[PDB]
């Protein structure tokens, strides 16, 4: 097939992966801390909300509840 070729002015944004990789093993002050620039963007985080508690009820798993 003939393939549509040509130049486009692209642009690189913010929001790289290097400052969003956030992880936590045990205890406070997590070991993989992202850069502290949220700015009205608290999208839950490393939590387990009531909407996600209702999903594992639908599977019927009773010991994953006590583990998590």
């Amino acid at each position: 097939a003939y393939i549509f070729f040509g130049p486009i002015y692209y642009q690189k944004l913010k929001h790289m992966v290097l400052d969003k990789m956030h992880a936590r093993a045990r205890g406070p002050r997590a070991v993989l801390t992202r850069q502290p620039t949220e700015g009205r963007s608290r999208d839950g985080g490393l939590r387990l909300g009531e909407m996600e508690r209702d999903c594992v009820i639908a599977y019927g798993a009773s010991q994953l509840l006590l583990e998590r």
Binding site: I57, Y59, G60, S62, Q63, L65, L66
Partner: protein, 48 residues
């Protein structure tokens, strides 16, 4: 109120119990006995 107290729920996976069989016979669960109460039984109701 089982997720608040940390109890196992009675629906889904915790709707039953599993138990393990001992698989022992009644030949080993015997009241083993050889001349224990024979001394005290005869000399307790004779002529009295």
């Amino acid at each position: 109120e089982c997720i608040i107290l940390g109890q196992t729920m009675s629906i889904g996976t915790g709707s039953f119990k599993v138990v393990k069989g001992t698989n022992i016979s009644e030949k080993d669960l015997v009241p083993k006995r050889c001349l224990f109460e024979s001394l005290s039984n005869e000399a307790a109701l004779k002529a009295n």
